[PDB]
Design an enzyme around this catalytic site. Structure first.
Site, PDB file in Angstrom:
ATOM      1  N   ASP A  37       0.828  -1.201   0.000  1.00 20.20           N
ATOM      2  CA  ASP A  37       0.000   0.000   0.000  1.00 20.20           C
ATOM      3  C   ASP A  37       0.866   1.257   0.000  1.00 20.20           C
ATOM      4  OD1 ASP A  37      -1.928   1.925   0.319  1.00 20.20           O
ATOM      5  OD2 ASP A  37      -2.462   1.391   2.382  1.00 20.20           O
ATOM      6  N   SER A  51      -0.548  15.511 -12.142  1.00 24.50           N
ATOM      7  CA  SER A  51      -0.802  15.141 -13.522  1.00 24.50           C
ATOM      8  C   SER A  51      -1.034  16.397 -14.359  1.00 24.50           C
ATOM      9  CB  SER A  51      -2.006  14.197 -13.602  1.00 24.50           C
ATOM     10  OG  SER A  51      -2.403  13.949 -14.936  1.00 24.50           O
TER      11      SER A  51
END
Length: 330
Positions: free
Chosen positions: A35, A199
């Site tokens: 994770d 992004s």
């Protein structure tokens, strides 16, 4: 040193991925959910409330000659999906894919929430976010990666998650045969303890690319792709009959639909998520309403590039003095 381990989807939907981890002496192999959005290595154990164990493999520290109780240490964690767990702490030898750390903090669960009990395939979590998020008190502990880092050939790990198929976590090296083209690296902020990056935009299907900054986290422990409501609405508008259902808890679409791809930007590069990666199947057994793999982050407070996005790429988690993230197509 290096390590390399195969990671396997837990079910036919790729809801999560499990990776075998050797703990203790002799080894006890548990299948952990790696994770990159949390920083605790915790396990089902011989200390876990018996009624809260249902099929998981447990760690029994009393059977490990290298286990030592970390005196006074406790831990307690709550995850974004509302699940939680807590307990006490041992140090022990932990190996992943041939890479060994001695003195790793292994957090033994005394209690786990229902979601964990109900998932027989996940024996615990291995956190790979920054150690500043580790919950051990009163002395915070380091992640497996943080402990291994100085010994690794290069201070990196890579995630290569499969679509409906096994994939690989590598530690200490970049497998140049595992991706196509080049890896594009992008800046990381560690201010919130996550692999947080920006992004450069998105496209829906064959549509034009929208240049827009989207801050979010690379999180292997989250199944879906959570993005701003504007972006998510633009995606689902291209699927006839798709709608946001408050009763179901997100966007659903007719199972008869063909889903468009979704592209996200990494600098000037582009990662394409095929439409089929966005299908999470019937909302309930036998239903013709299917659950979408792109959902709104509104009210999460952060955008999350979960498995839906990451499995479309070869992803480098570069833990150099100034960390960065790399993405390649594959």
């Amino acid at each position: 040193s290096t390590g390399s381990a195969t990671t396997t989807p837990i079910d036919s939907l790729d809801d999560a991925y499990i990776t075998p981890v050797q703990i203790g002496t002799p080894a006890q192999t548990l299948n952990l959910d790696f994770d990159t959005g949390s920083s605790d290595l915790w396990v089902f154990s011989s200390e876990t409330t018996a009624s809260e164990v249902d099929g998981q493999t447990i760690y029994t520290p009393s059977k490990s000659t290298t286990a030592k109780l970390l005196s006074g240490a406790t831990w307690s964690i709550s995850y974004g999906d509302g699940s939680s767990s807590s307990g006490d702490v041992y140090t022990d030898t932990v190996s992943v894919g041939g890479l060994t750390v001695t003195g790793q903090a292994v957090e033994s669960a005394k209690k786990v929430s229902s979601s964990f009990t109900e998932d027989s395939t996940i024996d615990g979590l291995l956190g790979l976010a920054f150690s500043t998020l580790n919950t051990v008190s009163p002395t915070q502990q380091k992640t497996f990666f943080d402990n291994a880092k100085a010994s690794l050939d290069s201070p990196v790990f890579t995630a290569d998650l499969g679509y409906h198929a096994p994939g690989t976590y590598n530690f200490g090296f970049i497998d140049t045969t595992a991706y196509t083209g080049s890896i594009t690296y992008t800046a990381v902020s560690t201010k919130q303890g996550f692999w947080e990056w920006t992004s450069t935009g998105y496209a829906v299907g064959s549509g034009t690319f929208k240049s827009t900054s989207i801050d979010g986290i690379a999180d292997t422990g989250t199944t879906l792709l959570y993005l701003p409501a504007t972006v998510v609405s633009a995606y689902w508008a291209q699927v006839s009959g798709a709608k946001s259902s408050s009763s179901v808890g997100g966007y659903v679409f007719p199972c008869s639909a063909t889903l468009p791809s979704f592209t996200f930007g990494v600098g000037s590069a582009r990662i394409v998520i095929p439409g089929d990666y966005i299908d999470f199947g019937p909302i309930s057994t036998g239903s013709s309403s299917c659950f979408g793999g792109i959902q709104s982050s509104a009210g999460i407070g952060i955008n999350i590039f979960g498995d839906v996005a990451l499995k479309a790429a070869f992803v480098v988690f570069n833990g150099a003095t100034t960390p960065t993230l790399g993405f390649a197509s594959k």
